[PDB]
Amino acid sequence: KVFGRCELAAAMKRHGLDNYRGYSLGNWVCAAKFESNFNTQATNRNTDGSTDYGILQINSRWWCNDGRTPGSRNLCNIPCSALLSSDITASVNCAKKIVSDGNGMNAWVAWRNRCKGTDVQAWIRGCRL
Ligand SMILES: [Cl-]
Ligand SMILES: [Cl-]
Ligand SMILES: [Cl-]
Ligand code: NA
């Protein structure tokens, strides 16, 4: 599924991400924009053999099981394919764990490089939320 901007904002709010760990909804929408361009089916291989999955590009090195990432963990206790669903519940639940892990949203390198410090409210501009 490719979400629209406000559509995703609303779904993230619906699943309790708005202001989760103090990160406003625009931060989460911005992260999704630059991780996946709002496409729930996005997958990208990392040079080390792990893969990133879904709207927030969650990495099989730590967070989900894909069966092909040696030595990895599965701290969200989910198959990585669950992170590709149209329904964003599994990605949101796992992202809540990731952002609680100590470094906040810096876990998403694209968020640090492209969202952090910027006018992230622009991402929810005009949205009926
Ligand atoms: Cl594995
Ligand atoms: Cl959803
Ligand atoms: Cl933080
Ligand atoms: Na894994």
PDB file of C-alpha atoms and ligand atoms in Angstrom:
ATOM      1  CA  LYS A   1       0.000   0.000   0.000  1.00  0.00           C
ATOM      2  CA  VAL A   2       1.239   3.495  -0.816  1.00  0.00           C
ATOM      3  CA  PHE A   3      -0.223   5.880   1.790  1.00  0.00           C
ATOM      4  CA  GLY A   4      -0.996   9.493   1.216  1.00  0.00           C
ATOM      5  CA  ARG A   5       0.661  11.897   3.623  1.00  0.00           C
ATOM      6  CA  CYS A   6      -2.416  12.815   5.715  1.00  0.00           C
ATOM      7  CA  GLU A   7      -3.740   9.270   5.413  1.00  0.00           C
ATOM      8  CA  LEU A   8      -0.560   7.952   7.027  1.00  0.00           C
ATOM      9  CA  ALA A   9      -0.562  10.651   9.662  1.00  0.00           C
ATOM     10  CA  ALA A  10      -4.068   9.625  10.626  1.00  0.00           C
ATOM     11  CA  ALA A  11      -3.166   5.928  10.718  1.00  0.00           C
ATOM     12  CA  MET A  12      -0.105   6.645  12.868  1.00  0.00           C
ATOM     13  CA  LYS A  13      -2.235   8.690  15.272  1.00  0.00           C
ATOM     14  CA  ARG A  14      -4.837   5.918  15.342  1.00  0.00           C
ATOM     15  CA  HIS A  15      -2.091   3.519  16.452  1.00  0.00           C
ATOM     16  CA  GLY A  16      -0.716   5.812  19.180  1.00  0.00           C
ATOM     17  CA  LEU A  17       2.451   7.056  17.548  1.00  0.00           C
ATOM     18  CA  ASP A  18       1.687  10.746  17.815  1.00  0.00           C
ATOM     19  CA  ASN A  19       4.002  12.162  20.492  1.00  0.00           C
ATOM     20  CA  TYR A  20       5.207   8.656  21.345  1.00  0.00           C
ATOM     21  CA  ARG A  21       8.473   9.045  23.268  1.00  0.00           C
ATOM     22  CA  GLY A  22       7.984  12.764  22.730  1.00  0.00           C
ATOM     23  CA  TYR A  23       8.194  12.585  18.931  1.00  0.00           C
ATOM     24  CA  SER A  24       5.456  14.554  17.241  1.00  0.00           C
ATOM     25  CA  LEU A  25       3.431  13.089  14.452  1.00  0.00           C
ATOM     26  CA  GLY A  26       5.306  15.076  11.791  1.00  0.00           C
ATOM     27  CA  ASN A  27       8.561  13.391  12.861  1.00  0.00           C
ATOM     28  CA  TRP A  28       7.046   9.970  12.223  1.00  0.00           C
ATOM     29  CA  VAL A  29       5.543  10.986   8.870  1.00  0.00           C
ATOM     30  CA  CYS A  30       8.835  12.546   7.799  1.00  0.00           C
ATOM     31  CA  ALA A  31      10.714   9.388   8.752  1.00  0.00           C
ATOM     32  CA  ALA A  32       8.301   7.238   6.752  1.00  0.00           C
ATOM     33  CA  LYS A  33       8.561   9.583   3.743  1.00  0.00           C
ATOM     34  CA  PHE A  34      12.296   9.226   3.506  1.00  0.00           C
ATOM     35  CA  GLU A  35      12.541   5.594   4.610  1.00  0.00           C
ATOM     36  CA  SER A  36       9.898   4.171   2.265  1.00  0.00           C
ATOM     37  CA  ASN A  37       8.143   7.003   0.403  1.00  0.00           C
ATOM     38  CA  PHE A  38       5.048   5.823   2.282  1.00  0.00           C
ATOM     39  CA  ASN A  39       5.136   2.373   0.624  1.00  0.00           C
ATOM     40  CA  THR A  40       4.377  -0.427   3.072  1.00  0.00           C
ATOM     41  CA  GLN A  41       5.976  -3.023   0.735  1.00  0.00           C
ATOM     42  CA  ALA A  42       9.420  -1.378   0.555  1.00  0.00           C
ATOM     43  CA  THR A  43      12.375  -3.729   1.149  1.00  0.00           C
ATOM     44  CA  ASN A  44      16.089  -2.883   0.903  1.00  0.00           C
ATOM     45  CA  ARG A  45      19.122  -5.075   1.377  1.00  0.00           C
ATOM     46  CA  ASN A  46      21.999  -3.798   3.517  1.00  0.00           C
ATOM     47  CA  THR A  47      25.621  -4.490   2.576  1.00  0.00           C
ATOM     48  CA  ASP A  48      25.982  -6.677   5.674  1.00  0.00           C
ATOM     49  CA  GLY A  49      23.298  -9.130   4.633  1.00  0.00           C
ATOM     50  CA  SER A  50      20.418  -7.798   6.724  1.00  0.00           C
ATOM     51  CA  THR A  51      17.319  -6.283   5.116  1.00  0.00           C
ATOM     52  CA  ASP A  52      15.094  -3.312   5.990  1.00  0.00           C
ATOM     53  CA  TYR A  53      11.326  -3.801   5.806  1.00  0.00           C
ATOM     54  CA  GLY A  54       8.245  -1.694   5.464  1.00  0.00           C
ATOM     55  CA  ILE A  55       7.145   1.846   5.898  1.00  0.00           C
ATOM     56  CA  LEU A  56       9.808   2.525   8.570  1.00  0.00           C
ATOM     57  CA  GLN A  57      12.520   0.242   7.088  1.00  0.00           C
ATOM     58  CA  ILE A  58      12.952  -1.907  10.155  1.00  0.00           C
ATOM     59  CA  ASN A  59      16.145  -3.963  10.075  1.00  0.00           C
ATOM     60  CA  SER A  60      16.328  -7.762  10.321  1.00  0.00           C
ATOM     61  CA  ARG A  61      19.749  -7.436  12.072  1.00  0.00           C
ATOM     62  CA  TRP A  62      17.918  -6.722  15.353  1.00  0.00           C
ATOM     63  CA  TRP A  63      14.177  -6.389  15.096  1.00  0.00           C
ATOM     64  CA  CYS A  64      12.454  -9.034  12.952  1.00  0.00           C
ATOM     65  CA  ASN A  65      13.104 -12.493  11.639  1.00  0.00           C
ATOM     66  CA  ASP A  66      13.621 -13.092   7.913  1.00  0.00           C
ATOM     67  CA  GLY A  67      15.519 -16.374   8.202  1.00  0.00           C
ATOM     68  CA  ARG A  68      18.511 -15.139   6.231  1.00  0.00           C
ATOM     69  CA  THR A  69      20.281 -12.752   8.593  1.00  0.00           C
ATOM     70  CA  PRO A  70      22.881 -14.837  10.510  1.00  0.00           C
ATOM     71  CA  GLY A  71      23.572 -13.877  14.066  1.00  0.00           C
ATOM     72  CA  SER A  72      20.675 -11.480  14.078  1.00  0.00           C
ATOM     73  CA  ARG A  73      18.001 -11.064  16.680  1.00  0.00           C
ATOM     74  CA  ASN A  74      14.192 -10.669  16.468  1.00  0.00           C
ATOM     75  CA  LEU A  75      13.476  -8.249  19.297  1.00  0.00           C
ATOM     76  CA  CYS A  76      10.031  -7.345  17.972  1.00  0.00           C
ATOM     77  CA  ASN A  77       9.213 -11.065  17.856  1.00  0.00           C
ATOM     78  CA  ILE A  78       7.706 -10.935  14.378  1.00  0.00           C
ATOM     79  CA  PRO A  79       8.445 -12.197  10.894  1.00  0.00           C
ATOM     80  CA  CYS A  80       9.827  -9.361   8.809  1.00  0.00           C
ATOM     81  CA  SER A  81       7.032  -9.980   6.272  1.00  0.00           C
ATOM     82  CA  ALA A  82       4.540  -8.728   8.874  1.00  0.00           C
ATOM     83  CA  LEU A  83       6.174  -5.337   8.521  1.00  0.00           C
ATOM     84  CA  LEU A  84       5.049  -5.189   4.838  1.00  0.00           C
ATOM     85  CA  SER A  85       1.310  -5.335   5.492  1.00  0.00           C
ATOM     86  CA  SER A  86      -1.227  -2.691   4.432  1.00  0.00           C
ATOM     87  CA  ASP A  87      -2.187  -2.473   8.093  1.00  0.00           C
ATOM     88  CA  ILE A  88       0.627  -0.632   9.865  1.00  0.00           C
ATOM     89  CA  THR A  89       0.024  -2.101  13.348  1.00  0.00           C
ATOM     90  CA  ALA A  90       3.046  -4.395  13.344  1.00  0.00           C
ATOM     91  CA  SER A  91       5.412  -1.711  12.058  1.00  0.00           C
ATOM     92  CA  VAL A  92       4.086   0.776  14.636  1.00  0.00           C
ATOM     93  CA  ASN A  93       4.431  -1.678  17.511  1.00  0.00           C
ATOM     94  CA  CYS A  94       7.971  -2.516  16.537  1.00  0.00           C
ATOM     95  CA  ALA A  95       8.885   1.142  15.944  1.00  0.00           C
ATOM     96  CA  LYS A  96       7.700   1.918  19.481  1.00  0.00           C
ATOM     97  CA  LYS A  97      10.240  -0.584  20.758  1.00  0.00           C
ATOM     98  CA  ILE A  98      13.011   0.784  18.533  1.00  0.00           C
ATOM     99  CA  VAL A  99      12.500   4.417  19.518  1.00  0.00           C
ATOM    100  CA  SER A 100      12.488   3.360  23.193  1.00  0.00           C
ATOM    101  CA  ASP A 101      15.880   1.605  22.874  1.00  0.00           C
ATOM    102  CA  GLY A 102      18.006   4.580  23.951  1.00  0.00           C
ATOM    103  CA  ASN A 103      18.812   6.770  20.938  1.00  0.00           C
ATOM    104  CA  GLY A 104      15.289   7.884  20.129  1.00  0.00           C
ATOM    105  CA  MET A 105      14.574   8.430  16.440  1.00  0.00           C
ATOM    106  CA  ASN A 106      18.296   8.522  15.592  1.00  0.00           C
ATOM    107  CA  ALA A 107      17.810   4.766  15.066  1.00  0.00           C
ATOM    108  CA  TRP A 108      16.434   5.837  11.644  1.00  0.00           C
ATOM    109  CA  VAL A 109      19.434   7.289   9.866  1.00  0.00           C
ATOM    110  CA  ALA A 110      17.197   8.986   7.273  1.00  0.00           C
ATOM    111  CA  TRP A 111      15.301  10.677  10.074  1.00  0.00           C
ATOM    112  CA  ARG A 112      18.558  11.999  11.526  1.00  0.00           C
ATOM    113  CA  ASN A 113      19.834  13.120   8.138  1.00  0.00           C
ATOM    114  CA  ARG A 114      16.649  14.492   6.613  1.00  0.00           C
ATOM    115  CA  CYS A 115      14.067  15.202   9.341  1.00  0.00           C
ATOM    116  CA  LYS A 116      15.832  16.003  12.594  1.00  0.00           C
ATOM    117  CA  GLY A 117      15.786  19.683  13.313  1.00  0.00           C
ATOM    118  CA  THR A 118      13.589  20.559  10.324  1.00  0.00           C
ATOM    119  CA  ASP A 119      10.059  21.961  10.182  1.00  0.00           C
ATOM    120  CA  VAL A 120       8.487  18.528  10.580  1.00  0.00           C
ATOM    121  CA  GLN A 121       5.024  19.996  11.223  1.00  0.00           C
ATOM    122  CA  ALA A 122       4.898  20.651   7.482  1.00  0.00           C
ATOM    123  CA  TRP A 123       4.318  16.908   7.080  1.00  0.00           C
ATOM    124  CA  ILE A 124       0.925  17.136   8.787  1.00  0.00           C
ATOM    125  CA  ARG A 125      -0.022  20.536   7.370  1.00  0.00           C
ATOM    126  CA  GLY A 126      -3.657  20.687   6.382  1.00  0.00           C
ATOM    127  CA  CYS A 127      -4.433  17.194   7.691  1.00  0.00           C
ATOM    128  CA  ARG A 128      -7.758  16.590   9.392  1.00  0.00           C
ATOM    129  CA  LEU A 129      -6.410  14.787  12.402  1.00  0.00           C
TER     130      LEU A 129
HETATM  131 CL    CL B   1      18.037 -15.052  10.386  1.00  0.00          CL
HETATM  132 CL    CL B   2      -3.280   0.948   9.160  1.00  0.00          CL
HETATM  133 CL    CL B   3      14.609  11.139  22.582  1.00  0.00          CL
HETATM  134 NA    NA B   4      16.825 -11.064  12.575  1.00  0.00          NA
END
